[PDB]
Amino acid sequence: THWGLVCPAETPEGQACGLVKNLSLMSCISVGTDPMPIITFLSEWGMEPLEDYVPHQSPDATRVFVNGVWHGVHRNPARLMETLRTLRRKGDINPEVSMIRDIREKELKIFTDAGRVYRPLFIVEDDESLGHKELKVRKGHIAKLMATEYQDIEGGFEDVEEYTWSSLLNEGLVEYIDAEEEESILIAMQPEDLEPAEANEENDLDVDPAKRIRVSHHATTFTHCEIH
């Protein structure tokens, strides 16, 4: 579970080996957020309170946990999960908040406390135009980022209003994933794995014998991609 959070082969040798750990690059720590807006959102969208919940005549109900506190049950977990994810990607909910859904355990957990370690990740969405899953970030965003990176050195006019990392987070192209959320997502090692699923299957091709031999593209249900 230390992948992308703490640096491997960094701990000092001796009696502190494996105890003194250093944070990896592109790793942040949440500061904490009040969960009251999330509770109000859950109640408004339709969520049975725990007071009137009975386990009988309701075997498909999924328990909802906020900051480790059981608040009620939900009969339609998938739509609630989609709505919460859309709200988080739109900036309505703080990106530091982590929401995890357990399909088999029928549990939905939301954490808004502090001390959690998260790292940014790319977002993969289905593209009907290309007929296969593709990254939500395209060449236009890269061009805008490069233009705003080259603009500050020489100054200039308003340009694109300083398209920055906050703009990427607001647009939903990049989202924060902590250790808990990594338990129910599929991550592609490189964007080159987001090719068509067939990828010219059963077609022999020549490769460089001096290059690394790798195995990938075995799954077509990718949800995230590593930045690097």
């Binding site: 998938a78 399909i103 088999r104 029928k106 129910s184 599929l186 077509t220 249900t221 990718f222 949800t223």
Partner: protein, 115 residues
């Protein structure tokens, strides 16, 4: 006890007892009598091995998990070329490595234990 007998009155469960004179086992509550014939030979069942075909909760949203691997095994009933497979959920070394295939079209669970 495969099933638990609950008193119709109140909500406590029923102790086992024998009528002696009638030579018939009867279940009786303690808050109230609630005497009935208790026509059930089952008094106690003990289990020692894992149940065959334990599978899991197999909720209707089992196909929405992106981490579940997919295969092309033929569905016995609907003859679909798509499904999701997972191993047994028992948490010890006694279980085998059999795979349970779940079709996302007809929600039918079929195993690969050809034997």
């Amino acid at each position: 006890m495969t099933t638990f007998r609950f008193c119709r009155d109140c909500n406590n469960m029923l102790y086992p007892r024998e009528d002696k004179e009638n030579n018939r086992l009867l279940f009786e509550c303690r808050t109230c009598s609630y005497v009935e014939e208790a026509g059930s030979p089952l008094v106690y069942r003990h289990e020692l091995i894992t149940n065959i075909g334990e599978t899991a909760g197999v909720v209707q949203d089992i196909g929405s998990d992106p981490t579940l691997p997919r295969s092309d095994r033929e569905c016995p009933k609907c003859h679909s070329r798509e499904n999701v497979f997972f191993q047994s959920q028992q948490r010890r070394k006694d279980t085998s490595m059999v795979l349970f295939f779940v079709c996302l079209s007809c929600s039918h669970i079929f195993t690969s234990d050809q034997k």
